[PDB]
Amino acid sequence: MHLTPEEKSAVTALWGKVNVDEVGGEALGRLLVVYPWTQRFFESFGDLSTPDAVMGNPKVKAHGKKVLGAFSDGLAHLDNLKGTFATLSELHCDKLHVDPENFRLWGNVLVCVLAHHFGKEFTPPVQAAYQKVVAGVANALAHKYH
């Protein structure tokens, strides 16, 4: 992952106007609805049978927030992504047994969510820089699978 300083600050400028509260659940939620097999990992969260159910779940909403927090941590340490996400990598490989491929799908949904949210402000060059960040994060998290 190699962002220019221009890319790093734009990413940073945008994320400031981001309310992890709502967006946190929009991303998790949409991950569950759009890639249904992921529901399997969250079976204690309750009902995720319909989009409504999922977009209504308060554990979904609460967990989402926590995830985007973790993500915000990375944005603050863009040069040390791997070291930032080492624990979480270990957790997802050795406790939850998540296939690293799903980290990629996750990065794509967050990107659609940011697009939805910021509309015309999510310009093509802004998406370009977030695509890189998102791949970086997928990679750090898969790091301790190898």
């Binding site: 949409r30 609805v33 989009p51 990107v111 659609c112 697009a115 939805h116 093509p124 060059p125």
Partner: protein, 141 residues
């Protein structure tokens, strides 16, 4: 392919796109080119600047066939048959690029359709885009 609820969501969302289909396609290419530079190589003789009429044209060409696909969502493989041979046999397009384009399309829709891009509609358009890709790469494996 595609649930009936899905079909309803596709038919509807594409209605909202309406006359912006060609516009939306072109923006999807510009997004793709910027985000995944590897893709540029499939259009060597094109001016890929922002408002290039050449990229506008490929958008409409893509948006039109998507529309044709919506129109024959029950016979896509026969509906997209020619486009399947062209991309696989003559163009030899890497299957991963159809995922790249589809994703850039979703991003574009999301940014222009804020009220209409519910989680539900997002899932329907994804399965729709995924189905089109699958038809167009069918000739490979």
């Amino acid at each position: 392919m595609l649930s009936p609820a899905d079909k309803t969501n596709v038919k509807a969302a594409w209605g909202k796109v309406g006359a912006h289909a060609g516009e939306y396609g072109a923006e999807a290419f510009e997004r793709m080119f910027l985000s995944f530079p590897t893709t540029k190589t499939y259009f060597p003789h094109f001016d890929l600047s922002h408002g290039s009429a050449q990229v506008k044209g490929q958008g409409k060409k893509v948006a039109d066939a998507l529309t044709n696909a919506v129109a024959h969502v029950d016979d896509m493989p026969n509906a997209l048959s020619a486009l399947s041979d062209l991309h696989a046999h003559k163009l030899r397009v890497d299957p991963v690029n159809f995922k790249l384009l589809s994703h850039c399309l979703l991003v574009t829709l999301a940014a222009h359709l804020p009220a209409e891009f519910t989680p539900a509609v997002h899932a329907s358009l994804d399965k729709f885009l995924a189905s089109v890709s699958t038809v167009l790469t069918s000739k490979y494996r």
